[PDB]
């Protein structure tokens, strides 16, 4: 919160208090906490009626150090996902000079909640065993339109891990995040188009158009109408099979069933098939584009800009080719002839409404020629082209119903919410800061610095070094779970179950999945993430050049540890283990926002542990740094991404060293800590350099001892901010020598990004839009860094620490409010009159299905009666049990 | 575990502490959790590839003895099952010049778990007693499909022996591990095509094809279209019969019933039939051949290249001729005309799609003409031809179906797991190390030394000396039980049962089969086996000649008893009795990994006895030995195959003599053990020879007393490693004279195999990729061996052992090992704030690890 | 490293009283009182007492 008086900053919580483990349950952060503060909409409103196109800024009155008040002062929302591929230059729109951003994922198997076979599987094994008395090869074991020989082979050799579904849900969420741009312009922020291109103005009247493979520059079109994968450069393959027999031997093990429970809508089901196929092949299958009408700052020149979504450039690796095994409409002997097959397929696949060129050209709406035994030839399609055709047909509202049926088969609530958290964490992105004296700055148009960007974690995003398709893979940025086809086949057919996989209602799908407001809401969910990571990196003083070289350096043993422990690179008992210091950031989050991050379990030997997205990042990236006004880099500061008003106006509770400077009130203004607090002033051989009250250990460490680094201390950091916020600090060694790190032109601090103003707005003044907390303390070569002032400059601030003088400062004129959570469920829902007319029946039928996973009305007691020899039925000699982990016991020594 | 400090060396377990018996039941160590060690590695230079094709290697940062840092240095995975038959030379494919490897086995009768009669077979024998004529009428048949007179005759026998399924399941596991290769190229890592042939680079785009009888040289093809047994030559014979009345006598007792459960186990019953036929005849029936496109190191010279799977070379069973009996569709008396025979049977056997040319040629898909009682001329097929037709259609998911059905009919859960253990132990193989001073070396291309290879048991493989088919004097490598046809007939008909034959749910089949990752999991499961054998052989310093000559003439008393108890010398009837000292190796395995090996129960004298692949090897092999550059054999060291980091880094606990040297330039850098530990130096300064602190002598100072050998003492072995890791060790005896073993050119130590690098990787530096623990103590002469340095060279290490100096040695920067600054400007010891904020969680993880 | 007690330093000295020259090897044995030192210990104590 903003502080009203120095009494409030002086009583603020210590950093260690906020980083403590917290034991209480807490609600999910829906992003509506920020909405009720920066917007007209307190409570509900229809998105059409609200015009949240203009609700895209922080606004308020500001007070200057000189005593004037600037009304209607403004600040941009820092984050975005759209990347311009055509920048306005000289009022005239032109091609981008800079290559596109890219991202990489490390997909892999890990132990999840422990898994157990269902009753339906026991019945199947008993059907086989009973079948063994008769010299008849018979098809009792058929289910849901599948061959009896297939259900037999899906009932074999279960994998202990469990089932995840996470990568599936990532691909779905990324797709949704892209199609949500397709809604009318009235309900997308204006700013979202101009975080990176600050010289353009979007037009409200016309909606954005979502296309595919349209980009002008650096080969971004992936062959255009004839497509290839953007990363591998290849082309996929996809084939549909009535039965598993027609699958070539090279790949009968990778086959996936497509359960009948999806496709049950009378809504086109040929599309639902395509969206099942998309969510298991490699992503991206093509580079999506957002084209939007925009105009010059004078309004004078109009055009169609091109954008690339950040969701469309992140690489989730996987499967180039798929065999999709379709359900049979009518129970029957296997279709040895074709007409027996097509008139009996539950759905007959055909290409979507778009033409494609190249080898195996596809006319629009073309029908797949079914595979069956004794066919004249094998048939398949390239999958990049098959997916290119449906690419224009998906939309938010159909993904909502799709996932609504998907929820009925497997619970998808908490899993989807965590996948959405990964979505926000990897896709929301912000430009690097410019140092200045005043409140606004931006880099020169169409420069490399203009387009350089960072994650909510203060890690930079990597760029491509050559035209697409990329010839060579980038390093992984984060690691995710994978979804096994085998245990997918087992779970879709009711043959297996786990505590995380319990089926849920279609109403349980989280609200973001349906709404047009979802883009704005994703934009607001990334701020608390930076607030957490920012407090983390700023608690210690380590500089950007120092993090940048830390993983390897041999100057100091402490620094190597401090970086090795923030990334997820450890394991035990065959499963992933969360990063050790990611838990600090997680705690820091829970304590500041009073909300709980979404998590997923990992089973270490049957003991569940929670992993959050704070704990799963991987080493390799450069850290975030500000640029000079001329474009030169600046190394000296700790990593920063956002102005500190964001950090300090949206937290329920905050660290002391980061609080706002209090408003002037009569005599009092601002004040500093002294020796009565345990601090003491640094002096050197020079008589014209003065450094603030600091720690007492500061006297005995020009270089930190190996194995040790600077320690948390809020008050010394506060004093460091007081020295910094004067217009003329000097960044120097214990002796007054220059440090190796690049330093800003004198008296400048990093400051937030400029955007065009609306009528009646004013630009932010002075240090109202700057970062302040980034106080360097640890140099790259192991030296301390000191903030110095000359003696005459030094007198008023020191007396301010001694509480005998006051220092002028600027502030926002904003009061504090922080709401109790808006919703418990994580899903919106309201009773209609009919919901009340038909209440109890739903309430018990629901519970009667939730327990009904893998149940059938026939019980073992009935099917025993039909059995020939009941004692020899495997269900008798093997009552089923949950598999242990890492693996179930085998060959015990008696 | 690798060590961050010397404090972690002193506090390590002693060897005898881990060789101690442990009571607690443990869990199988599947390759699925060994998988997670290769991935999830520390390092910032590492791109974390998701494909299993790239995850084939141990990547890490390294730190020099001089204090420099090296990023993303490489260490190849040692094991493989593919033997190249077309080596690249001069960057082009060239026909191999080296003969193929071979393995054998002593199959044994299984008298353990003798069978019990069912009430059905009991009442049948009662009916034979009381002479009930009606029950075996001429045209009576069961729904099973077999007529009653055959049941009444099969039941009349009394059998002592139980049923096993060991050789059966073993052959199925071998065919499986051959068929797994045919799966997507991304699903199989490239290092496996370049362990023996380091100059070859496989293509990811195109799958390996699994052919048969395509080898270029040494008679490997076994006649091509005319298939013939690789081992002993000849064709076998197969005949299908509807009844045991038709099978020729002197052949009747051998004929096998094929239950209907087998024939309904797949989409094509003729294929399940063919696979059962493979399941109970001799192996290999042919030489399978994996072919793969590969290219030049520069990519310049693409082509198909041939590989012979190791599984294809093991010899098991070998029964030559077989008569199979089949179920009938209808309740009818035994067929008399030919058409009445062919229409009768449940399935009519036939060749698969591949054609054959022979004296008895088989057209593709040719139908078999069933035998009948009045037949003018008996009918029959060649066996190798028969199986040759179907050699192209076996497939791992089909084998998976087949396994689910077997699991349903009878138990398969455990036996298949043990059979899988035998498969890994026998078919996983590594090349002998070359000696060097540095991190990487390999023998010259297309050479006899390039292809020498050893088991995980550190026993060298046998190599064929002549063209196929071979006609050898047998040299068995290990015992296995045999699957008995008669007991199978007693069980298939419901006449009998056994205590381990309990039927299981199909979902209980072990998850390895039918899964495409199985090859990679095989390679991984091979490493811990080597760790246990390695720690066995390194605890005592016996040289490689002293083991090689320990079963031949040059033996001692002590070498005699020593080789005698390592192996399964004993031979009681119908049993496999475990080695006395194999138990120590199983204990090492269970203490160092907190996991257990697969067991087979076996009874002697009414005493129960578990047995493991550790306990069932056979004596008379040759041990792993290092080569010199330019190929000269050297055999001073105790036997070795793999680099120390594998041992240090996969184990949870290791004995004190084996730990990693802590990083240079720190306080608590590598040191040594001196007089207080109860040790004493042997100086020989008159000749410039000084040797470490060692165990106090017990009348064993120059020659060991007869029947005794060197004693276990960790600290002395540690000191021996300290002397060795200096660059100029000298292997002499008590007087300072030469020993009979061949010795490395001075300063060389055995080092790991070279493979081509990927982009951004580095060759390993210094002694980071080397065996070190292989320190000699006992020569073939019976004399002690001493590691000497000159008096001048020997002064610093003596100060280190004395703990008044530190030594500088290279190390991996993994886990908790951090680089040490040259200054060491220490401050007051201080807990970090972050370490206290997140300590409990760190404890919760460790508790969760201990629980498992 | 010496201050840190992980190394030794080399400096010259007078060989007077109980200072004896140190051999370059330091092949230490078990600490052992000499027989002559025990036979004549009490006398040595009597001198010091005096």
List, as one string, the DSSP characters of B20-52: S---S------HHHHHHHHSS---SS-----ST
Question: In whole angstroms, how far apart are CA B211 and each of B292, B306, B391, B467?
Answer: 11, 10, 8, 20
Q: Are B172 and B365 in contact (CB under 8 A)?
A: no
Q: State this model's resolution in angstroms.
A: 3.0
Listed residue (B657, B658, B735) closest to B689, CA to CA: B735
Instruction: Give Cβ neighbours of residue B482 (< 8 Å, ≥ 6 apart).
Output: B107, B108, B109, B110, B164, B166, B167, B317
B-interface mutation test, from C28, C30, C31, most B Cβ less than 10 A away: C28
Which residue's entry shows tokens 């298949």?
B416
Separation of alpha carbons A206 and A185, rounded Å: 6
Can you read off the two tokens belonging to residue B237?
Answer: 């014979």
Contact C4 B795 (CB under 8 A): no
**Helix (H) or strand (E) run with residue B397 in it:** helix B396-409
DSSP characters for A616-638? Answer: -B-S-PPBP--B-TTS-B--SSP
Tokens for A280, please give them: 């298991």
Q: What length is written for chain C?
A: 50
Distance from CA of B707 to the nearest CA of A (A): 35
Q: Which residues of B touch C9 (CB under 8 A)?
A: none
* CA distances for A469 relative to A84, A86, A306, A384, B280, angstroms: 19, 20, 19, 13, 53
Choose the closest CB to C6 out of B675, B680, B806. Answer: B806
**Which CA distances in Å does A278 have to A174, A402, A556, A576?**
12, 13, 48, 27
A714-725 vs A791-801: helix axis angle to the nearest 10? 140
Q: Which two tokens stand for residue A586?
A: 């997680």
Check if B719 contacts C (Cβ < 8 Å).
no
- Give me the helix-helix angle, B518-539 and B31-38, nearest 10°: 80
Alpha helix stretches (DSSP H) within A30-144? 32-35, 47-50, 119-131
- Distances, alpha carbon B333 to alpha carbons B156, B330, B375, in Å: 22, 9, 16
Structure token digits, residue A384: 């990049």
Asked if B245 reaches chain C (Cβ–Cβ under 8 Å), the answer is no
Rounded Cα–Cα distance for residues A371 and A298 (Å): 61
CA terminus-to-terminus distance, chain C: 43
Facing residue for A573 by CB, picked from B408, B825, B852: B852
Query: Which tokens hold the place of B144?
Result: 């099973």
| Conformation bin of residue B599: beta by default, left when phi > 0, alpha when psi is -120 to 50 | beta
Q: Which distant-in-sequence residues (6+ apart) come within 8 Å of B566 by Cβ?
A: B579, B581, B582, B617, B619
Going by C-alpha positions, the residue among A532, A590, A588, A656 that lies closest to residue A12 is A656
Chains contacting B (3+ CB pairs below 8 angstroms)? A, C
| Residue numbers in B near C3 (CB within 8 A) | none
CA-nearest residue of chain B to C25? B795
Mutate to test the interface with C, among B686, B805, B820, B829 (most CBs of C within 10 A): B805
Largest CA distance in chain A: 106
Taking only residues 650 to 679 of chain B, the set having a beta carbon closer than 8 angstroms to any beta carbon of chain C reads 667-669, 674-676
Q: Calculate Rg over the CA atoms of chain A.
A: 31
> Which tokens go with B794?
């020997």
Instruction: State the DSSP code for C18.
Output: T
In B150-200 the beta strands, taken as DSSP E runs, fall at: none
Query: Which of A156, A547, A620 is the best residue to mutate to test the B interface, defined by the most B CB atoms within 10 Å of its own CB?
Result: A156
Lookup result for tokens 């469920």: A825
Max CA-CA distance within chain B?
Answer: 102
In sequence order, which ranges of B681-794 are alpha helices (DSSP H)? 714-725
Provide the token pair at A685.
């051989």
Q: Which residues of B744-753 are buried (b: 16+ CB within 10 A; e: fewer)?
A: beeebbbbbb
Interior CA angle at B785 toward B784 and B789, to 5°?
A: 140
| Best B788, B824, B825 residue to mutate vs chain C (most C CBs within 10 Å) | B824
Residues 3-42 of C with CB under 8 A from B: 4, 6-8, 24-30
Residue of A349, A350, A283 whose CA lies nearest to A319 = A283
Classify burial at A164, counting beta carbons within 10 Å of its beta carbon; exposed 0-12, middle 13-18, buried 19 or more: buried
Residue with tokens 């502030």, as numbered in its chain: A811
Q: Taking CB atoms and an 8 Å cut-off, how many pairs form between chains B and C?
A: 37
**Chain B contacts of A475, Cβ < 8 Å?**
46-48
Helix or strand holding residue B840 (H, E): helix B839-851
| Chain C partners (3+ C-beta pairs within 8 A) | B
Distance between CA atoms of residues A404 and A410, nearest Å: 10
**Residue A73, class by beta-carbon neighbours within 10 Å (0-12 exposed, 13-18 middle, 19+ buried)?**
buried
CA A311 – CA A522 distance, rounded (Å): 12
Q: Name the DSSP class of C7.
A: S
Q: Please provide the DSSP assignment of A734-795 as one string.
A: TTSPBPSS--PSTT-EEEPBP-PPPTT-BPPPTTSSB-------B-TTSBB-EEEB-HHHHH
**Residues ≥6 apart with Cβ < 8 Å to A314:** A102, A103, A104, A105, A174, A283, A284, A426, A427
Q: How far apart (Å, rounded) are the C-alpha atoms in residues A379 and A370? A: 8
Give me B682's structure tokens.
Answer: 């042997």
B402-438 CB burial, b ≥16 within 10 A, e <16? bbbbbbbbbbbbbbbbbbbbbbbbbbbbbbbbbbbbb
- Please name the helix (run of DSSP H) or strand (run of DSSP E) that holds residue B593, with its range, or none: helix B582-593
Q: Which helix (H) or strand (E) holds A239?
A: strand A237-241
Q: Which residues pair with B670 in a beta bridge?
A: B807
B507 and A CB contact within 8 Å: yes
Tell me whether the omega of the peptide bond preceding residue A874 falls within 30 degrees of 0, making it cis. no
CA distances from A465 to A288, A461, A470, A471, A472 (A): 20, 13, 8, 10, 10
Helices B166-179 and B396-409, axial angle in degrees (round to 10)? 160
How do strand B106-108 and strand A730-732 relate by DSSP bridges?
Answer: unpaired
**Are C and A touching by the rule of 3+ CB pairs within 8 Å?**
no
CB B241 within 8 A of CB B327: no
Phi and psi at A146, nearest 5°, equal: -105, 150
For residue A478, list its beta bridge partners: A105, A617
User: Distance, in angstroms, between C43 CA and closest chain B CA?
Assistant: 31
Contacts with B260 from chain A: Cβ below 8 Å: 132, 134-135
**Would the CB atoms of A887 and B47 count as touching at under 8 Å?**
no
CB pairs under 8 A between A and B: 294
Residue B356's SS3 state is strand
- Interface residue of C25, C29, C31 to substitute, partner B, most B CBs within 10 Å: C25
C1 touches chain B (CB under 8 A): yes
b/e for B67-102, b at 16 or more Cβ within 10 A?
A: beebbbbbbbbbbbbbbbbbbbbeeebeebebbbbb
CB B721 within 8 A of CB B604: no
Is the CB of residue A708 less than 8 Å from the CB of residue A558? yes
User: Which of A141, A583, A711, A890 should be substituted to probe chain B, the one whose Cβ sees the most B Cβ atoms within 10 Å?
Assistant: A890
The distance from CA B736 to its chain's CA centroid, rounded to whole angstroms, is: 41
Taking residue C49's Cβ as centre, other Cβ atoms within 10 Å add up to: 6
- DSSP H or E stretch at residue A274: helix A270-278
Q: Which of residues 326-345 of B touch A (CB under 8 A)?
A: 327-329
Do the Cβ atoms of B207 and A250 come within 8 Å? Answer: yes
Distances (CA, A) of B90 to B200, B296, B297, B446: 11, 10, 11, 10
Q: How many CA atoms lie within 13 A of B798 on its CB side?
A: 23
State yes or no: cis peptide before A886, omega within 30 of 0. Answer: yes
H or E segment at B429?
A: strand B429-431
CA angle A354, A358, A364 (to 5 degrees): 20
| Residue B601, H or E segment | strand B600-604
What's the Cα-to-Cα distance from A75 to each of A9, A58, A519, A751, A764, rounded to whole Å?
24, 5, 19, 11, 7
Residues 6+ apart with CB under 8 A from A68: none
Contact B30 A887 (CB under 8 A): yes
Closest C-alpha among A698, A846, A819, A651 to residue A41: A819
CB contact under 8 A, B346 and A122: no
The single-letter DSSP state of residue B220 is: T
CA triplet B291, B296, B299: central angle to 5 degrees?
110
Token digits of residue A784:
């301390």
Name the token pair of C15.
């060989």
The widest CA-to-CA distance across chain C, in whole angstroms, is 43
Q: Where do we find the tokens 């003991």?
A: A607
A489 Cβ neighbours under 8 A, 6+ residues apart = A154, A255, A256, A257
Nearest CA in chain B to C27: B681
CB contact under 8 A, A552 and B143: no
Question: Which tokens belong to A368?
Answer: 């797949």
Question: What angle, 0 to 180 degrees and rounded to 10, lies between the N-to-C axes of helices B396-409 and B269-279?
Answer: 80
Instruction: Enter the tokens of residue A887.
Output: 């693996």
Question: Distance between CA B513 and CA B507 in Å, rounded?
Answer: 12
Minimal Cβ distance to B826: which of C4, C8, C29: C4
**Backbone phi and psi for residue A681, each to the nearest 5 degrees, phi listed first:** -65, 135
CB proximity under 8 Å: B 387-416 to A = 393, 395-397, 400-401, 403-405, 407-409, 413-414
Q: Name beta bridge partners: B542.
A: B778
Provide the 3-class DSSP secondary structure of residue A272: helix
Cβ atoms < 10 Å from Cβ of B588: 26
- Rounded to a whole number, what is the distance in Å from the CA of B6 to chain C's nearest CA? 13
Please list, in sequence order, all residues whose beta carbon lies within 8 angstroms of the beta carbon of residue A417, skipping any fewer than 6 positions away.
Answer: A28, A510, A598, A826
Which residues in chain B are contacts of A873 at CB distance < 8 A? 503
User: Are residues A108 and B50, on separate chains, in Cβ contact within 8 Å?
Assistant: yes
Residues for chain A: how many in total? 894
Which of the other chains make 3 or more beta carbon contacts under 8 angstroms with chain A? B
CB B275 within 8 A of CB B405: no
Instruction: Report the distance separating Cα A323 and Cα A237, nearest Å.
Output: 9
Task: Give the 3-state secondary structure of B474-489.
Answer: CCCCEEEECCCHHHHH
- State the Cα–Cα distance between residues A392 and A551, nearest whole angstrom: 45
Cβ contact, residue pair A249, B844, below 8 Å: no
Interchain CB distance below 8 Å, B827 and A560: no
Outline where DSSP puts E strands in A64-188.
69-76, 83-84, 86-89, 92-95, 103-108, 115-117
**Contact status of B688 with chain C (Cβ, < 8 Å):** no
Please report, to the nearest 10 degrees, the dihedral formed by the alpha carbons of residues A350, A355, A356, A357 taken in order: 120
| Three-state DSSP string of B748-761 | CEEECECCCCCCCC
How far apart CA A99 and CA A102 sit, in angstroms, is: 10
Which chain C residue shows the shortest CA-CA distance from B685?
Answer: C25
Q: Between vectors from CA B800 to CA B795 and to CA B803, what angle results, nearest 5°?
A: 130
User: Strand B69-76 relative to strand B82-84: parallel, antiparallel, unpaired?
Assistant: unpaired
- Chain B residues with CB inside 8 Å of C7's CB? 805-806
Task: Nearest by CB to A569, from B41, B823, B842: name it.
Answer: B41
Contact assessment for residue A654 and residue A592, using Cβ atoms and an 8 Å cutoff = yes
Sorted by sequence, the CB contacts under 8 Å of residue A116 that are 6+ apart come out as A496, A497, A498, A880, A881, A882, A883
> Is some CB atom of chain C closer than 8 A to the CB atom of B472?
no
Give the whole-angstrom CA distance, residue B238 versus residue A198: 83
Task: Give the position of tokens 């300590």.
Answer: B839
Residue B342 CB neighbour total at 10 angstroms: 16
Q: Does A696 touch chain B (CB under 8 A)?
A: no
Mutate to test the interface with B, among C4, C5, C6 (most CBs of B within 10 A): C6
Q: Exposed, middle or buried: residue B850 (CB in 10 Å: 0-12, 13-18, 19+)?
A: exposed
Picking from A504, A603, A573, the residue whose alpha carbon sits closest to that of residue A114 is A603
Q: Which of C4, C24, C28 sits opposite B802 (nearest CB)?
A: C28
Computed from CA positions of residues A298, A303, A306, A309, in that sequence, does the dihedral angle turn out positive or negative?
positive
Distance CA B845, CA A608 (A): 10
Integer CA distances (angstroms), A816 to A65, A718, B486, B754, in order:
22, 22, 88, 66
Cβ contact, residue pair B28, A890, below 8 Å? yes
Could you tell me if residue A678 is left (phi over 0), alpha (psi between -120 and 50 degrees) or otherwise beta?
A: left
């Amino acid at each position: 919160p903003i502080s009203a008086d120095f009494s409030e900053v002086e009583n603020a919580p210590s950093f260690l208090s906020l980083a403590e483990n917290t034991d209480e349950v807490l609600k999910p952060y829906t992003g509506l906490e920020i909405q009720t503060i920066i917007t007209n909409i307190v409570g509900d409103a229809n998105p059409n009626q609200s015009r949240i196109f203009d609700q895209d800024r922080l606004r308020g009155n500001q007070y200057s150090a000189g005593g004037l008040v600037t009304q209607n002062a403004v600040s941009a929302i820092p984050f975005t996902n759209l990347i311009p591929r055509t920048i306005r230059v000289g009022n005239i729109l032109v091609n981008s000079a800079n290559r596109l951003q890219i991202t990489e994922t490390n997909v892999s198997e890990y132990y999840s909640n422990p898994i157990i076979a269902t009753k339906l599987s026991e019945m199947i094994s008993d059907q086989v065993k009973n079948n063994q008395f008769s010299t008849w090869r018979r098809d009792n074991t058929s289910l849901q339109g599948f061959n009896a020989f297939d259900i037999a082979t899906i009932n074999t050799a279960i994998l202990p891990n469990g089932l995840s579904l996470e990568s599936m849900l990532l691909k779905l969420s990324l797709l949704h995040s892209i199609k949500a741009m397709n809604v009318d312009a009235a309900s997308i922020n204006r700013s979202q188009y101009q975080v990176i291109d600050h010289n353009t103005v979007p037009t409200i009247g016309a909606p954005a158009v979502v296309g595919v493979n349209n980009s002008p520059v650096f080969g971004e079109d992936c062959g255009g109408n004839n497509p290839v994968y953007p990363f591998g450069g290849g082309t996929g393959a996809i084939a549909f099979h009535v039965t598993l027999q027609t699958v070539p031997d090279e790949r009968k093990s990778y086959a996936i069933f497509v359960p009948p429970a999806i496709l049950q809508a009378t809504s086109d089901a040929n599309e639902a098939l395509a969206l099942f196929a998309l969510s298991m092949s490699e992503w991206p299958h093509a580079l999506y584009t957002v084209t939007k009408q925009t105009t010059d700052l004078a309004g004078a020149n109009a055009g169609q800009q091109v954008f690339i979504p950040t969701q469309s450039t992140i690489h989730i690796g996987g499967r180039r080719v798929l065999d999709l095994i379709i359900p049979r409409r009518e129970i029957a002997p296997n279709p040895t002839t074709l007409v027996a097959a097509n008139a009996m397929c539950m759905v007959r696949p055909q290409a979507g409404p778009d033409a494609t060129a190249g080898a195996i050209p596809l006319a629009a709406g073309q029908l797949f020629n079914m595979n069956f035994i004794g066919a004249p030839a094998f048939e398949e399609w390239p999958m990049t082209s098959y997916l290119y055709s449906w690419a224009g047909r998906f939309d938010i509202t159909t993904i909502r119903q799709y996932m609504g049926r998907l929820a009925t088969m497997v619970g998808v609530k908490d899993a989807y919410w965590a996948a959405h958290e990964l979505n926000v964490a990897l896709s929301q992105v912000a430009p690097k800061m410019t140092t200045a004296a005043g409140g606004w700055a931006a880099q020169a148009a169409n420069s490399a610095q203009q387009s350089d960007v960072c994650y909510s974690s203060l890690l930079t995003v990597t760029r491509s070094a050559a035209n697409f398709p990329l010839a060579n893979q980038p390093a992984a940025d984060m690691r995710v779970y994978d979804t096994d086809p085998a245990t997918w086949n087992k779970v879709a057919l009711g043959l297996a179950t786990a505590a995380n996989l319990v089926p849920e209602q279609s109403m349980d799908v989280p609200f973001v999945v349906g709404d047009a407001r979802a883009s704005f809401w994703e934009r607001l969910q990334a701020i608390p993430m930076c607030i957490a990571w920012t407090m983390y990196y700023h608690s210690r003083g380590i500089t950007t050049l120092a993090w940048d070289n830390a993983y390897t350096d041999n100057t100091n043993k402490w620094l190597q540890k401090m970086v090795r422990n923030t990334f997820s690179t450890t394991q035990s008992v065959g499963t992933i283990i969360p990063a050790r210091y990611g838990k600090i950031v997680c705690n820091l989050y829970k304590n500041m926002f009073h909300r709980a991050p979404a998590y997923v379990a990992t089973s270490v030997g049957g003991k569940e542990l929670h992993i959050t997205h704070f704990e799963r990042w991987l080493p390799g990236g450069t850290y975030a740094n500000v640029y000079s006004g001329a474009g030169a880099v600046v190394n000296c500061f700790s990593p920063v991404l956002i102005p500190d008003i964001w950090c300090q106006y949206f937290t329920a509770k905050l660290p002391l060293f980061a609080g706002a400077f209090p408003p002037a009130q009569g005599q009092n203004s601002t004040k500093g800590f002294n020796s009565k607090q345990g601090l003491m002033i640094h002096r050197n051989q020079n008589n014209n350099l003065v450094a603030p009250y600091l720690e007492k250990f500061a006297d005995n460490s020009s270089y930190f001892p190996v194995g040790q680094g600077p320690e948390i201390n809020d008050m010394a950091t506060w004093n460091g901010r007081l020295w910094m916020t004067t217009g003329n600090v000097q960044y120097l060694d214990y002796s007054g020598a220059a440090i190796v790190e690049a330093v800003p032109p004198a008296g400048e601090l990093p400051v937030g990004k400029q955007i065009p103003l609306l009528a009646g707005e004013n630009a932010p003044i002075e240090l109202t839009n700057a970062a302040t907390t980034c106080v360097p303390r640890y140099s790259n070569d192991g030296r301390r860094i000191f903030t110095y002032l000359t003696t005459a400059q030094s007198v008023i601030p020191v007396q301010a620490c001694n509480r005998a003088a006051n220092l002028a400062r600027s502030c926002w004129l904003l009061s504090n409010v922080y709401a109790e959570p808006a919703l418990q469920a994580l899903g919106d829902e309201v009773e209609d009159a009919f919901d009340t007319l038909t209440n109890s029946s739903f309430l018990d039928v629901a519970k009667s299905v939730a327990e009904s996973a893998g149940e059938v009305p026939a019980t073992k007691a009935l099917t025993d009666l039909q059995a020939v020899d009941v004692s020899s039925l495997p269900s008798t000699s093997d009552p089923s049990n949950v598999l242990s982990q890492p693996a179930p016991l085998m060959s015990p020594p008696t």
